[PDB]
């Protein structure tokens, strides 16, 4: 039995806006849970960020958790953007508010509830459990099966 969750996160998308999908595994408890769903009008940076909501949305106590993941948005997010977005009320330097704030927020709401550690990790240098998340990312990609209803074109 492993001490700590670890999740794994990918996700894909076909065009700008075109079908996308999101592959997530979490080993938590003594299970092995993967999480797959693809939405038929999205964006690849939509995907990277609903695949770590579903798997943090899947803890139901307070956890100590690692995440790996390759996404330089997750990535910038968490190290440069979402502390100063807070600190200005999730508005850019214009005052309009911050493109996909639906998700940021509902990621927040998702961190502040456990103690992540962040792997970020080379695409071409990721654990197997990366490689399968890209692959269920890419099948649902195919099959989309969902609506993004956050999605936007303007902001």
């Given at each position: 039995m492993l001490k700590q969750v670890e999740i794994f996160t990918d996700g894909s998308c076909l065009g700008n806006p075109g079908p996308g999908g999101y592959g997530a595994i979490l080993r938590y408890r003594g299970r092995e849970k993967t999480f797959s769903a693809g939405y038929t009008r999205t964006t690849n940076n939509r995907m990277e960020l609903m695949a770590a909501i579903v798997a943090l949305e899947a803890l139901k106590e307070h956890c100590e958790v690692i995440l790996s993941t390759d996404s330089q948005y997750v990535r910038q997010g968490i190290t440069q953007w979402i502390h100063n977005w807070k600190k200005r009320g999730w508005?850019?330097?214009?005052?309009?508010?911050?493109?996909?704030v639906d998700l940021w927020q509902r990621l927040d709401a998702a961190l502040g509830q456990h103690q992540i550690k962040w792997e970020w990790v080379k695409g071409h240098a990721g654990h197997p459990e990366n490689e399968r998340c890209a692959e269920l990312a890419r099948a649902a990609a195919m099959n989309p099966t969902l609506e993004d209803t956050g999605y936007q074109v303007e902001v």
């Open positions: 508005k850019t330097a214009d005052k309009k508010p911050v493109k996909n």
